[PDB]
Amino acid sequence: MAHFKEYQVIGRRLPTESVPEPKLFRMRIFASNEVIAKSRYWYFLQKLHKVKKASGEIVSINQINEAHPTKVKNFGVWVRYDSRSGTHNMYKEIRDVSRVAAVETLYQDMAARHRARFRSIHILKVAEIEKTADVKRQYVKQFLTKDLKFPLPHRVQKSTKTFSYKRPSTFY
Amino acid sequence: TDSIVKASNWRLVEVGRVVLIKKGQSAGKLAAIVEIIDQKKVLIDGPKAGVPRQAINLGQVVLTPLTFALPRGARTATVSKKWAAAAVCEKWAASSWAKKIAQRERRAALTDFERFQVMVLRKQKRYTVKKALAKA
Amino acid sequence: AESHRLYVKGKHLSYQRSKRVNNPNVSLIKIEGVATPQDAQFYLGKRIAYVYRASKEVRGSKIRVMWGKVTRTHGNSGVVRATFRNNLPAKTFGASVRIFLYPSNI
Amino acid sequence: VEPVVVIDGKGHLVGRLASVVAKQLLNGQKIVVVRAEELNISGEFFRNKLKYHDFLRKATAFNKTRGPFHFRAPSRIFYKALRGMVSHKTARGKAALERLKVFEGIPPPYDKKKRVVVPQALRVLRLKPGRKYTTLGKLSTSVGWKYEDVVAKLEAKRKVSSAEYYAKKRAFTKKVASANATAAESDVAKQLAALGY
Amino acid sequence: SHRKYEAPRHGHLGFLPRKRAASIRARVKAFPKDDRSKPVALTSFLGYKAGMTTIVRDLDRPGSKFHKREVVEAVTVVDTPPVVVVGVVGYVETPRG
Amino acid sequence: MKYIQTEQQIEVPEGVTVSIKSRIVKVVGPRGTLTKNLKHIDVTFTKVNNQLIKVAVHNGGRKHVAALRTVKSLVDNMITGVTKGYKYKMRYVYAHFPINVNIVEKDGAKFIEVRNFLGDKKIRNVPVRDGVTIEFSTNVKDEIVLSGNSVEDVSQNAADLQQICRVRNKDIRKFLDGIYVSHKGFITEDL
RNA sequence: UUUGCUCCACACAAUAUAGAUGGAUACGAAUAAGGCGUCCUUGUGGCGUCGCUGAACCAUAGCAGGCUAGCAACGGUGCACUUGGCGGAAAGGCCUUGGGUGCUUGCUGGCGAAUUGCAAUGUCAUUUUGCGUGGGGAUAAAUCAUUUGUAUACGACUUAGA
RNA sequence: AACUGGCGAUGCGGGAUGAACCGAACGUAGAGUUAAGGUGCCGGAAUACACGCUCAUCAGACACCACAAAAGGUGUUAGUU
C-alpha cells in the first residue's frame, strides 16, 4: 500500500510495585508509521497475553536503519494468511536487498495471484537465504544461474506527436 | 554449405555493461551493471557518472552494446577501477547520435544575429552550392 | 520578411462543462502545442485577438476582433483560458486566434 | 502542417484508433484516409462475422427494413465503430463529422502524396503477442463486398509505378548525395557546424 | 399463444414490390457468358406476343409414360423482325462496378 | 514459468543448403527443396556452421515449449522429406463384394474407381493428391504405395483417403470393410 | 421569345467565409528488421551503414518588401509562347523542346523613411452575382387543348396529329 | 412489533434511469477551494506512470443497482504435503 521501515517497538506491560519494569519486550515492526506499528504491536500483544491496549506500556521505538545496505541478498518467507476458503501457512523465497521490497512484491503476488487481502494475513518469518543450496524455488534457481547475456527482440519507442512519417522497425 | 541466418540479433546484455540510463536523475548518464537482480531490475553503478551502487527498472534503462569486463560482486573502487580499465565513453562519443544530440543542442545555442549569419551562410554557402552546381 | 506572423496561434475548444453544463462565459482554450505547464507564469496576461471579417463595417474597418489574455492553467497538461469583453457565440469551436507577447516582463 | 492529412491504414487498431481519431476532427481537422482494406483487430477471424450476423437481425417490426441498416463498405463498417465514439448529431458535432475522407485503396489523385501511420493505433504495437486478427476486405468480400480485386490490381499497378518512380528517386538522390558529398570542408560548414550542425 | 397448427402460407418474397412496377420494358439481372476464346456473340433477343395455339408432335423418353407416342402441345408463338445495329459504348470497369 | 532462454538445436547434414531470410528459410535437400513461412514463431534462427541451427526465444513460455519442442519434430519431418521422403502402403477390405480399384485418369487428376462397393451401383472415385506419388502395390492384394515428402502429404492423403470408406447403414461395429492402411515407408527406402 | 440566349478580355459594384496568412515536401517489402550505400560470380553472396527522431529538408533581408548605381560570374528564377511524352480509379494531372524576359540580398554605391505620435488588426483569400466595355458562338424544347389503348376511381401510364 | 435516519414538508453535486440511496441542504452576488463522484470517445479531466493475472466458439467492465447453484474441467497460474 506504501513503503515500510524496519521499526523496533519495545514494550514493558505496565509496571506495578510488585513488578516495577516488566522486561521491556520488543518487536521489530515493518511499517510506515510508528503509530500503526504500535497498533499492530498491540494487535499481536493481545494474541500473546491477557492484555489490552491500555493494560500495558511501550518502552521505545527504533527504526532499525542500516549501516551497510550495499550487500544484495536472498530471502526466506513463512506466511500465516487467510484466504477466501483456506487459511494456511506458506514458505516462498525472494531475492532482495531489503525485506520491505519482498513485502511489496509479496502482496502484489498474493493480492494479484491469489487475490489475498492483507487484513487477515500475518507474515511469520523471514529467514533470509544465504547459499546456493538454501533454495527450493526454481525461479530463484534461475537467478542462481550463470551469465545470461542476450539481445532484445521487439524494441518499442514512443511517437513524438502521434505519428511517424514511417512504419518503423522493432530492432533494438 | 549455407545455413545463412539474416537478422533477429541486436544489442546484447551483460553484467558490467555500461548502459545509457535512459531516464531519471541521470537521464542519460552511463553506468556499469554490477549485478543482475531479476528480469525487471539489475544492480548498477556509474562511478564515472558518480551515480551510486543502485538498481533500476530494466524497462526504465536502455542499453548500450558497449560491453566491458567486470568482476561481479565488487565495490566502487573495483568498479571505477574497471572503468579505469574502461575509459570508453569516447566511443558513444564516437556514436554520431550522441553527437547529434550535441548538434540539436548547438542548434539550440544560437543568437538571432548568429542565426541571421546562418541564413546568409545558406545564401553564400548555398550560393557556392549553386556555383558548384551552377553549370556543374 | 517572408513569414509575416509574430504571435501565438490557438484554437477555441469550448466553454467548460464541469461535467455537464457549459460555462458559457468561461472557456476551454487550445494552446499552440504546449503540454509543459511550467512555462506559463510569463505568459499569464498575454492578450488574444480574434479577427473575424464580417461584411458589415464598424467605425474604421470590416475586420473586427474579440480579445482575451492568459490567466492560469487547468488539467494534467496545463491548459489556460481567456477573458472576454464579449463572450463567444458558443460556436467558435476550433477557430484560430492570436495570442501575443505583451504585456512583456521584458 | 497538413491541413488535409493523407494517411495509410495498414494493419492498425480500431476502437483505440477511432476514439482519439474521434477526438481529432473536433478541432476542425481534415484528414484523408487511403487503403481502407488493411485493418486488423485483436481477436480471431472466426467469431466476428458471426457477431455481424448477430447484429444483422435487428430491425423495426411493422416495416422490417426501416430499422438499422446493413452495409459492406469497410469504411462504413468502420463508422459503425466510430459512430458511438462521437457526438455525431449536432451543428457542432456534424460540423466536425463533415471534415473527413476514407478510401479503399489509393486513387491516382492520391498517389502523388506521402503516407503516415500512428504507433498508438498500430496493431503490432498494442499487442500481447499471441493474438489473432482479421484481414478487412477479405472478411468484407467474404460476406459479399465483391469489388476488392479491381483496386487490388490497381494498387499493384501504382505501387509498381511509384516503385519505378522510386527507382528514379533513390537511384537519383545517391548521385545528389555524391553530387554535394564533394562539398566537404567549406569553412561555412565549419562555422554552421559549430553553430548547430 | 401459438395458433393451432403449422401450414404453408402464400406468396414469394424475391419479387417485391407489387406496386405499379418498373416500366413498360423490363429489366435484365443476369446475362449469358462472354468468352473471348469465341467470335462475336451476343446475349439475347426481343420479340412480340403474336399468338398461341395447340401443336401436335412426338414423345420418346424411354422409361417414361408416353415413350414412342405423340401428344399435342399448347405452344406460344412470337413475332420477330430483323433489327438494325447502329451503336457501341465502352464501359470503364470501376471498383464500384 | 518463463524459462529464460528456449531454443531448438538441430544438427544439419551436408547434402542440404537452406537460407533463412531473417525468419524465412530456403530449404534444399538431396531430394529437393522445401520452405516455410516461419514468421509465426518470432525466434532468432541460428546457423552455427552448416551442422546445427537453433531457434531463439529470449525467455520462452510454458505452452510455448509445449509447441516449441515439436517445432523440432516437424522440422525433422521436413528434413526427412527434403532428403529422403515417405512412402506408405495402405489396405483395402471387402469380404463378399469384390471392389475394383483403379487409378482411373481424369486428365492427370488420377481418380480411383472403387467398384462393387458392397453391391453399390454407385462408384467411388478418388483423385490423387499430387506430390505424394502412388503406384499400385503389385503382388499383394488390397495394397497400394504412396510416396511423398510430408507426413501429411502421405498421412493426410491416407487420412482422408482413409475417410473415403467411412461406411454407414449397417451394424458396422460388426460390418467391417474399407480402405485401411498397411505400412509407412520411405521414397528412398532404407532412408 | 428587346438581336434575344450563350462563351473571351475587362472594370465597377454587390458578394459570404464551422474558420488563408513561408512550404502537404509521393516506392514497395520486413518486423525474432531490414534499409541504403558499397563490391563481386550476383547470391537469401562482400563490405560498410543506420537508428535510439521531422529537431528532416526546402525557403528565407528591401515601400508585407522601395528606388538606384558600379564587381566576379554566366547561374537561378518567373512570365507567356513553343516541343515532346505519359496519365481512367476520379485519368484531368504528370514529365519534355526552344525563345525571351526579371532578379540575384553572391561583391562594392547613392538614397529613402518620421507624426499612427505611449497600445488601438490599424485592413494583402475566394465567395458569387450584376453591369459595361469589346472579342465569340448558337438559331430550341415542352405543356395545355385534340387522338391511341394495352391505361386508369382520380391523379398517373401509353399512341397519333401541317 | 422495539432503535436511528429521510420523504412527506426539500432543493443542489454522484449512481445512463431512479420519493426515502453517496456528498452536501437553500439571501443576492463575485474572487480563490473541494466533497460525492470521477479523468479512451461522447467526457470536463491523464490511451499518466508501477507490479502481476487472464484470452473468454458463452471474458470482463461492480455500494445503491437492477443476480446462478450442486456438480465438475491433465485449462491456466502459483504454492502445500
UniProtKB/Swiss-Prot annotation, chain A:
Subcellular location: Cytoplasm
Cited Pfam families: Ribosomal_L18A
A GO biological process held by the record: cytoplasmic translation
Assigned GO CC terms: cytosol; cytosolic large ribosomal subunit
Modification type Phosphoserine: residues: S32
GO molecular function list: structural constituent of ribosome
Organism domain of life: Eukaryota
TM ranges: none
SUPFAM superfamilies: RplX-like
Location (main, coarse): cytoplasm
Keyword vocabulary terms for this entry: Cytoplasm, Isopeptide bond, Phosphoprotein, Ribonucleoprotein, Ribosomal protein, Ubl conjugation
InterPro entries to which the protein is assigned, alphabetical: Ribosomal_eL20, Ribosomal_eL20_dom, Ribosomal_eL20_eukaryotes
Cross-linked sites for Glycyl lysine isopeptide (Lys-Gly) (interchain with G-Cter in ubiquitin): K125, K131, K149
PANTHER family given in the database record: 60S RIBOSOMAL PROTEIN L18A (PTHR10052)
Protein family membership: Belongs to the eukaryotic ribosomal protein eL20 family.
Miscellaneous section: Present with 54300 molecules/cell in log phase SD medium.
HAMAP family membership: Ribosomal_eL20
Record note on quaternary structure: Component of the large ribosomal subunit (LSU). Mature yeast ribosomes consist of a small (40S) and a large (60S) subunit. The 40S small subunit contains 1 molecule of ribosomal RNA (18S rRNA) and 33 different proteins (encoded by 57 genes). The large 60S subunit contains 3 rRNA molecules (25S, 5.8S and 5S rRNA) and 46 different proteins (encoded by 81 genes). eL20 forms multiple interactions with RNA and proteins in the central protuberance, connecting components of core functional centers that are located far apart.
Name of the protein in question: Large ribosomal subunit protein eL20A
Organism this protein belongs to: Saccharomyces cerevisiae (strain ATCC 204508 / S288c)
Lineage: Eukaryota, Fungi, Dikarya, Ascomycota, Saccharomycotina
Gene symbol of the encoding locus: RPL20A
From Swiss-Prot, chain B:
Subcellular location field: Cytoplasm
GO molecular function term, any single one: structural constituent of ribosome
Highest taxon in the source lineage: Eukaryota
Post-translational modification: N-terminally acetylated by acetyltransferase NatA.
Pfam families: KOW, Ribosomal_L14e
Main localization, broad class: cytoplasm
Entry annotated with the keyword Ribosomal protein: yes
CDD domains with a match to the protein in the record: eL14 (cd23702)
GO biological process, one term: ribosomal large subunit assembly
Gene3D superfamilies: 2.30.30.30, 6.10.250.2270
GO cellular component, one term: cytosol
InterPro entries for the chain: KOW, Rib_uL2_dom2, Ribosomal_eL14, Ribosomal_eL14_dom, Translation_prot_SH3-like_sf
This protein's record includes keyword Acetylation: yes
Sorted UniProt keywords: Acetylation, Cytoplasm, Ribonucleoprotein, Ribosomal protein
Subunit structure: Component of the large ribosomal subunit (LSU). Mature yeast ribosomes consist of a small (40S) and a large (60S) subunit. The 40S small subunit contains 1 molecule of ribosomal RNA (18S rRNA) and 33 different proteins (encoded by 57 genes). The large 60S subunit contains 3 rRNA molecules (25S, 5.8S and 5S rRNA) and 46 different proteins (encoded by 81 genes).
Record function comment: Component of the ribosome, a large ribonucleoprotein complex responsible for the synthesis of proteins in the cell. The small ribosomal subunit (SSU) binds messenger RNAs (mRNAs) and translates the encoded message by selecting cognate aminoacyl-transfer RNA (tRNA) molecules. The large subunit (LSU) contains the ribosomal catalytic site termed the peptidyl transferase center (PTC), which catalyzes the formation of peptide bonds, thereby polymerizing the amino acids delivered by tRNAs into a polypeptide chain.
Gene assigned in the entry: RPL14A
From Swiss-Prot, chain D:
Keywords for this protein: Acetylation, Cytoplasm, Isopeptide bond, Ribonucleoprotein, Ribosomal protein, Ubl conjugation
Entry PTM: N-terminally acetylated by acetyltransferase NatA.
One biological process term in Gene Ontology: cytoplasmic translation
PROSITE patterns: RIBOSOMAL_L13 (PS00783)
Keyword Ribosomal protein among UniProt keywords: yes
Cross-link (Glycyl lysine isopeptide (Lys-Gly) (interchain with G-Cter in ubiquitin)): K175
Gene3D superfamilies the UniProt entry points to: 1.20.5.4280, Ribosomal protein L13
A Pfam family: Ribosomal_L13
Cellular localisation: Cytoplasm
Protein family membership: Belongs to the universal ribosomal protein uL13 family.
Assembly, per entry: Component of the large ribosomal subunit (LSU). Mature yeast ribosomes consist of a small (40S) and a large (60S) subunit. The 40S small subunit contains 1 molecule of ribosomal RNA (18S rRNA) and 33 different proteins (encoded by 57 genes). The large 60S subunit contains 3 rRNA molecules (25S, 5.8S and 5S rRNA) and 46 different proteins (encoded by 81 genes).
Additional comment: Present with 43300 molecules/cell in log phase SD medium. There are 2 genes for uL13 in yeast.
Name recorded for this polypeptide: Large ribosomal subunit protein uL13A
UniProtKB/Swiss-Prot annotation, chain E:
Domain of life of the organism encoding this protein: Eukaryota
Phenotypic consequence of gene deletion: A mutant confers resistance to trichodermin, a trichotecene toxin produced by plant-pathogenic fungi.
One example of a Gene Ontology biological process annotation: cytoplasmic translation
Molecular-function annotations in GO: RNA binding; structural constituent of ribosome
Cellular compartment(s): Cytoplasm
Chief site of localization: cytoplasm
Alphabetic keyword roster: Cytoplasm, Isopeptide bond, Methylation, Phosphoprotein, Ribonucleoprotein, Ribosomal protein, Ubl conjugation
Cross-link (Glycyl lysine isopeptide (Lys-Gly) (interchain with G-Cter in ubiquitin)): K38
Post-translational modification Phosphoserine, affected residues: S23
Keyword Ribonucleoprotein: yes
GO cellular component, one term: cytoplasm
Entry's family note: Belongs to the universal ribosomal protein uL3 family.
Subunit structure: Component of the large ribosomal subunit (LSU). Mature yeast ribosomes consist of a small (40S) and a large (60S) subunit. The 40S small subunit contains 1 molecule of ribosomal RNA (18S rRNA) and 33 different proteins (encoded by 57 genes). The large 60S subunit contains 3 rRNA molecules (25S, 5.8S and 5S rRNA) and 46 different proteins (encoded by 81 genes). uL3 forms together with ES39L one of the contact sites for the signal recognition particle that targets ribosomes to the endoplasmic reticulum membrane.
Other noteworthy facts: Present with 450 molecules/cell in log phase SD medium.
Protein name from the UniProt record: Large ribosomal subunit protein uL3
Shown residues in whole-protein numbering: 2 to 98 of 387
